[PDB]
Structure 1
């Protein structure tokens, strides 16, 4: 009758929220114990195929470490982690807010007032990650999600699906020519562009024809963008990594100091007091409204180290 064991049978599968090559994300209801009835996302990974690849294991382990060590309002919160013989289980907060760039489709385009807010929250998350010496690397629209209140939550610190996109990669990533944290500020620029124009800054016909447009780095500024937004984009989307904004020791502070964010109260923003442009309806805590419908039912289908000490219960 001591501390709760927290095995897979503590959760009821409600629905699929996404499938990948390495595993699945479910919406789950905890059915016994400390949060009996609360809704989580359950990420389930296949140990056997993770350990078949170094880079894959590296990402898994890193994530498991990041989500224990790094806790921030705009970063997904890990609640439990555990494992069985063949599977790894991560229990994160269920982010009923869905993807942010899913709104981009119904808006067509984000207004600068709106995009700013979300870029502002994202930047604060990126800034904290860098402070802990973590670079997020392959940042893309898919990764930005929203909580029940509609605030930004970064996610996907581990593996990829399929076993993705490349137009949000900085040039120095595609060249494989080494990269510092300045790589994440490019991604912010490319996300800003996507928000304010609908699609990525540079896009081609195929795998390598796309790369060429990114390497050449040609600014396609639409006239409706304000002076400041034009300036910030040409400062975030610089080819030369050293010349990029936020590349210097200023980092996030350097970015956040730009006139584009002149209206952001950072204290209130971080405290999540500023009302977000889009607050998603409720009608429940288990609402999957903006998680579209490729997903339904519920079914989960000796070198054990070192997922050794994988177990975790969040102190909160």
Structure 2
């Protein structure tokens, strides 16, 4: 049975209206985890559900305990640094690079949607890299919100919004900026809903096909909003060189390899 006293405090990873996430070290194993702490007072789609859903690119929930007035979920912390950090350093990624990350993400969501689970949070901030350069969908915000249009209009969080999530995340990695990075900001509601998303000219006709598909303002017409769900996305022109079995297998070679010795190498824990 884990407990508060089993860990050492390192840093604040994120706060919120739900609670906070802390970086800690299990004193026994010396390992590093991210302790998500929730006020019982404030408050189940994250608990149990996300606790038993294991998967190569989804963050694993190591221990789950509770204090007298808070819920604690100790989770595995990827130490390859967050994508956002990496993307900003390179301004943009190779259409292959995007393709790479996109596929591991697409693998994570095919799995989730199969367990009838809608992620809701596919977005750059929630993306890190493990010590081998593989992607890790983290459960928290380490930025203008880009809620799916059907979320903005009908508060409908169906399977589809994860694809949009993918889409917005993949419009950034390859384009280096959000679809409306310039235009004011209070205009997103109107923009995301009624504004055609423009694509750089320097885009491979397939990538431009993908983005357009992942960003259809109609979930019913979105690439992946089809009754076949992920298949549509796994089978899009942009994803040919894709060996979907190698992905879940952590077989593909990470195109960029974070610079850490062991998972205890705590360098990506600053800025």
TM-score, normalising length from structure 1? 0.79
Aligned pair 1:166/2:145, yes or no?
yes
SS at 1:142's partner residue? Answer: helix
Aligned pair partner of 2:242 in 264, 269, 273 = 264
CA deviations 1:177-213 (Å, max 9, x no partner) are 5342112111211111111111111354233x12212
Aligned pair partner of 1:206 in 185, 188, 191 = 185
Could you tell me how far apart the structure 2 residues matched to 1:31 and 1:289 are?
Answer: 19
Find the counterpart in structure 1 of residue 39 from structure 2.
Answer: 46
Find the counterpart in structure 1 of residue 264 from structure 2.
Answer: 286
Find the counterpart in structure 2 of residue 150 from structure 1.
Answer: 133
Could you tell me how far apart the structure 2 residues matched to 1:73 and 1:278 are?
Answer: 18
Contact 2:107/2:247 (8 A) holds in 1: no
Note the aligned Cα RMSD (angstroms). Answer: 2.0
CA deviations 1:43-79 (Å, max 9, x no partner) are 222222x23xxxxxxxxx2211222221111100001
Contact 2:118/2:157 (8 A) holds in 1: no
Higher relative contact order (CA 8 A, sep 6+): 1
SS at 2:198's partner residue? Answer: coil
CA deviations 1:227-267 (Å, max 9, x no partner) are 11111111111122211111112211210111211111111
Contact 1:101/1:195 (8 A) holds in 2: no
How much has 1:20 moved relative to structure 2?
3.3
Unaligned runs of 5+ in 2: none
Aligned pair 1:126/2:126, yes or no?
no
Unaligned runs of 5+ in 1: 52-60, 294-316
Distance change (3 Å), C-alpha of 1:45 and 1:179: closer
Could you tell me how far apart the structure 1 residues matched to 2:14 and 2:218 are?
Answer: 36
SS at 1:175's partner residue? Answer: helix
SS at 2:100's partner residue? Answer: helix
Equivalenced residue count is 270
Name which one, 1 or 2, has greater alpha-carbon Rg. Answer: 1
Contact 2:104/2:247 (8 A) holds in 1: yes
Instruction: Name the stretch that deviates more: 263-272 or 10-19.
Output: 10-19
How much has 1:165 moved relative to structure 2?
3.7
Alignment of 1:77-156 (within 5 A): 77-156=60-139
Distance change (3 Å), C-alpha of 1:178 and 1:17: closer
TM-score, normalising length from structure 2? 0.92
Contact 1:112/1:196 (8 A) holds in 2: yes
